[PDB]
RNA sequence: GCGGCCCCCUGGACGAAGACUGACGCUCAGGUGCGAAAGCGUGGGGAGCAAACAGGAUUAGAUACCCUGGUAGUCCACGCCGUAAACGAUGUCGACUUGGAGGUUGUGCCCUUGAGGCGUGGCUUCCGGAGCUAACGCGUUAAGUCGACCGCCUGGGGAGUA
């Protein structure tokens, strides 16, 4: 997006603020999706397998990590 | 040698170059310096140090225009923005505000097909 | 939690410009219900209203555009 | 007999030419059957994007219970009267009261 | 979609009295009214296929109610087929 | 509409003809008629100037009002005639004061429709206006090129001019050829597209249809002798030559726009 | 299969309390209708992408991937085709048989006493109990225990070809 640097401000914190605005608004992620075309089969496969990844990490996280290792 | 003391900097970075164009407020460009002009051909064109030497030459190219304070616009992904905005104040400048103005389509057109290899 | 089930409104109406400045981000994007916790039907009515207000030049589409 | 929020905008300068139009917009509706239920002029205020190269358009809200066909003819005026710049007619459940 | 007042008129045009709304002539009368309105629609748009499935479903249910009534009480069935205006 | 003829005989085998019920089965209105002799392509020196013209049916000229000089008075459409001179069906409009006049019938037009001309009337299909009251992005027909001349462009069946732009006194039209043009804004134009849009879908079947259309046979170059046509002669179909018209100028590619005093109006040449 | 916004026309499902007809039901050979993409027909449109194609590379070779171009097509209307890994590889309807977590959409009661808790529905996702199964797994949406009706299979190849 845009940031503003006001007076009496270090430049390096403004550079890091700009990187944070880039991470927040989404330049990199949507650009990385929009280099080359994805057929709607593959975007459906992506979102569905991501949902399986979220619950197949999550249920192992909630109930297989409640018992100790050693 | 037309004195315009303030200005805007466009930093177009794709994955294969880094073109830095220092322009006035009204859009009239004053001279540029790409990452690929100053030597730096092939795989050494896309390094962030190429953006550093590009902004380096681009800052010294406009000494007759008396640019004392500038506004950074950046456009595109890839090894551009960070190294060139770090170099653009080691060059000696007063960057008053920084913006990312990358062009995003709102699901407009069809991008080309996927590179298999 | 939510602000609309805690309010009790039967439709988030687009004319409510203060909270419909609240619910988008700085960059004019609709912030999801995952991170704000808005319930689903009020999320859909809120997104519908923000689109209808974007057409009405009371909200920006993105920030950067002239 | 349906209830429509008609929201339209006019130029910045022609706020002298807005009000009597609403009056013939009154004659648009109550001439046939139409009950006008609100009139809240938001007036000239500032735009998030300059449609036809101008900020600060004139917002006029108007709510109506009316037959549909005079609203079809009202859109045939909203297309071709070259003062009104952006104009949507949405359908609602009831005729409402407050701002 | 055959608003309630038209249904009230036709159920006080075919029923035993006001409230008997589930008898067979009433159902066939509602289906014939709905069919004729929707044939007013389908002369235009020509390809609204989901509304075509709804229409073919109420045609088939009209046909089922009519030959049920033909099996049970033929005397009411001939009065219905002469009153509501259809071929078979 | 467009119907195919059942192939009882070859001339009926290939015919696809356009039937239309709205056309008035009857003799046309008489005071708007006059006689119209066929020429055969022969000027006052008697010689053929344009070949492949002659014969066919005899036909009478329907005087059609393109000017629309009557203003501010309403009119209603009595009936639709079939005109032999042109590709669009015409309409006999009747004004309220008592006048009957032939107009070019647009696409959306049935008998009993209401039409008013002038600078006032409306934006309905059928109404004549200047090109200062017709909005940008519109779709017009029967466009004047000179103020008061009568109406030149977009007069065939189904053609239409999209009004693109307006810079001061000038209106940029996108013509049907693809050419862009500046025209004067004060010129008249009628809204809508011209009717009979299925006119391109007739295929005439046989030789006699183009013959009684008013068109003679067309003889190829390679058949003729080297005196008659530059693609003459040969021992059994040699060609060898760049294609030309019978009068030397090379056809099939050569541009000959040679006006030079009207290029100020052309924004874009056809591509 | 459907993805900005708005109106016009319209199908269907769900929930509440009731009111009404009174077995009007289920399934379906043949038949008919809908049926992604590609493809065909005539007419418009044609930005981006891109079969075919051309050129540059890579390679032993490369009429492939990679790169630079690029015509059909993709788009709209009206007709045709009638096929797909047309895939929960699971016919349709109905019944019975412990659970826990979730999603969406309702509704009833109590205090809204306070973003509430308390019960009844519909559709849907995950793990598992009995039971079944060659195992994998399914597991109240069954591949469990049953009933009705339809379709289908009989070694692989020939071949869903003549």
UniProtKB/Swiss-Prot annotation, chain F:
Residues 38-47 have a biased composition (Low complexity). GO terms for molecular function: RNA binding; rRNA binding; structural constituent of ribosome; transferase activity; zinc ion binding. It comes from the Bacteria. GO terms for biological process: cytoplasmic translation; negative regulation of DNA-templated DNA replication initiation; ribosomal large subunit assembly. The modification N6-acetyllysine is found at residue 241. The keyword Acetylation applies. PROSITE patterns: RIBOSOMAL_L2. Changing residue 229 to Q: Loss of peptidyltransferase activity in reconstituted ribosomes. No change in rRNA binding or assembly into ribosomes. Signal peptide: none annotated. GO terms for cellular component: cytoplasm; cytosol; cytosolic large ribosomal subunit; DnaA-L2 complex. InterPro entries: NA-bd_OB-fold (IPR012340), Rib_uL2_dom2 (IPR014722), Ribosomal_uL2 (IPR002171), Ribosomal_uL2_bac/org-type (IPR005880), Ribosomal_uL2_C (IPR022669), Ribosomal_uL2_CS (IPR022671), Ribosomal_uL2_dom3 (IPR014726), Ribosomal_uL2_RNA-bd_dom (IPR022666). Residues 27-52, 220-271 are annotated as: Disordered. Gene3D superfamilies: 2.30.30.30, Nucleic acid-binding proteins, Ribosomal protein L2, domain 3. The keyword Plastid does not apply. Keywords: Acetylation, Ribonucleoprotein, Ribosomal protein, RNA-binding, rRNA-binding. It holds the Pfam family Ribosomal_L2. This protein can be partially replaced in vivo by its H.marismortui (HmaL2) or human (L8, from the 60S cytoplasmic ribosome) homolog. One of the primary rRNA binding proteins. Located near the base of the L1 stalk, it is probably also mobile. Required for association of the 30S and 50S subunits to form the 70S ribosome, for tRNA binding and peptide bond formation. It has been suggested to have peptidyltransferase activity; this is highly controversial. In the E.coli 70S ribosome in the initiation state it has been modeled to make several contacts with the 16S rRNA (forming bridge B7b, PubMed:12809609); these contacts are broken in the model with bound EF-G. Belongs to the universal ribosomal protein uL2 family. Part of the 50S ribosomal subunit. Forms a bridge to the 30S subunit in the 70S ribosome, contacting the 16S rRNA. Interacts weakly with S6 in one of the 3.5 A resolved structures. In pull-down experiments interacts with CedA. This is Large ribosomal subunit protein uL2. The lineage of its organism: Bacteria, Pseudomonadati, Pseudomonadota, Gammaproteobacteria, Enterobacterales.
